[PDB]
Amino acid sequence: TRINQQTECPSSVHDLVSCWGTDSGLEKRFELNFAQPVDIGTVTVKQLASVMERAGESLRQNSAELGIHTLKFDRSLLVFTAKQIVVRSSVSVMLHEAVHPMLELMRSHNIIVDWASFMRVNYGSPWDMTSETSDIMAHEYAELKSAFPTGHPYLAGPVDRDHCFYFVYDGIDRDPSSCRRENDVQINVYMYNVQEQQLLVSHCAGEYETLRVSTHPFASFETNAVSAASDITKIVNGLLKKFYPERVLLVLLQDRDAMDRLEGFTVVHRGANHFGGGYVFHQATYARS
């Protein structure tokens, strides 16, 4: 039941998706970084709002704080600082439909995106053909590889278990005479089957802790505070007690310029992705004993 069809090679990744190719993720994340810090007021809320309409999201609330702009939509949360635009959303949100419009918004403002990521945390496995997970991920890959031909996708963890599929474009200029530095801190704590809200808490300018809780229930924590890097063990423990989930997924960023056991939790998988650009993305999945 298999013959050889002489077929053309798709010219673009979009031809491959349509020609040769419900959603079971838990959360999608889209981040952009810049070559030079951006003025916080340069990018209006109206412009960011209209860019998320392309992915079917209507702005509902937004607060302005020191070095931060927070936009709350129905199913997504958007933080905007001088260093990064980070938007996290539920899986019913086709966040890849906002990748290109977001990039155009940057270009109109002469803002150069030199680093970007698209991440989705999966409870399930894409190869489950009773689910649309795969087709969504093929579309995601189309918008990303179309926008970042130099970008690449990676899959951290077992494909059949809790894992992260993320795509990373790295266009950072590292000439010795360059002033672009990478001391970024990123810590993500995903908690499955906790025992609904979107929140941002800011303790310092340009630094935040976002918490998302939504439907199987789960809660999604993220922070970029330099203080958090010092005591990761303290903050995760405090998170597991308030929530008490069945399984946990940690992602720890060790940046270029700069988690062995959890209480009542056995390790399922752990590993790191050292990128050529010197930074590392550490991951570990745990399950309750």
Add this chain to the structure above:
Amino acid sequence: XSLFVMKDRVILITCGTITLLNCVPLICEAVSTVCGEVEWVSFMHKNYSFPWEQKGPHLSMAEEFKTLRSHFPSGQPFIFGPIDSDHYFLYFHSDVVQPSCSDDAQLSMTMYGLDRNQTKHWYSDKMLPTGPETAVIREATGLSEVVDDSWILHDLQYEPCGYSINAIRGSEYQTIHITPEEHCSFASYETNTCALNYSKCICGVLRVFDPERFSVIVFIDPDSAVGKSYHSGGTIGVEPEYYPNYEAHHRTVNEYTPGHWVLKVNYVKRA
């Protein structure tokens, strides 16, 4: 390809379109006759250069996973490295009831863009088993340096091109496979030697081929020589220092099962 049967395991290596998994039911029978029991099964393949030509359960990694799952349901699949660039696919199943001691080693290399002055010697208009003609090829290319006289070896020069060689010394093995077509150059090396540091072993292979890019993957066991070395901050021979003319592009570290680790690194030559 290569088959390595040992007192306690089987290692079957194949290239091309050969459907390697069809022999699993037979390997299980082979283990049952001797009254053994399967406790560890690993299927692994570097990302295919021409995935559209792979047949049977190998046309897609979802097929390889479905197939391997039909036989070993507990197993787990992994993908190390960039999925649209150099990467490895692993399916790993283990039924270790009795804790044991793991002192094994596995070193694998995959190389592309082989030295054009070398591809000349892997051509021949006739099939040649191990013979003086092949000895001319091992000296002429530098393989004699990788496989010294202290190894029992048998090699095969293909027609019109292609070179395979196997070597065994005690309980250690060594395998080289070469595709020399200029447009799709490729060479592979795998050994299970105990070594506190693979740098010399690896560079020995690189001098033979000097490829534009190559991937090295190391499987570290907890009770092996290099296992103790790695787990104590010591170098193991894959660090970028040992390859000045190469720039490390992406590296991966994974404890794919409790106590056992795998390291993969992708290198690319500089300008």
Add this chain to the structure above:
Amino acid sequence: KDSLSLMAMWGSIARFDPSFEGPEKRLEVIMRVVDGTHVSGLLAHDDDVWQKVIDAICAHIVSREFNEYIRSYVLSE
């Protein structure tokens, strides 16, 4: 096809120049030893047993060497 194999393909298309498949497939089966297991382990078998295995994938053995620890076979397509 699935999206991960789809990505793996686009990365091979971007490097396709008008071809033989070099990258290999590796299968490794390690067996447990119990009382009553042949003291020779899998080495108790004869070359007849492994020839039938290779036939299952439609290949053949060209040459064979061995020693007290391991049996080796070069295979051909």
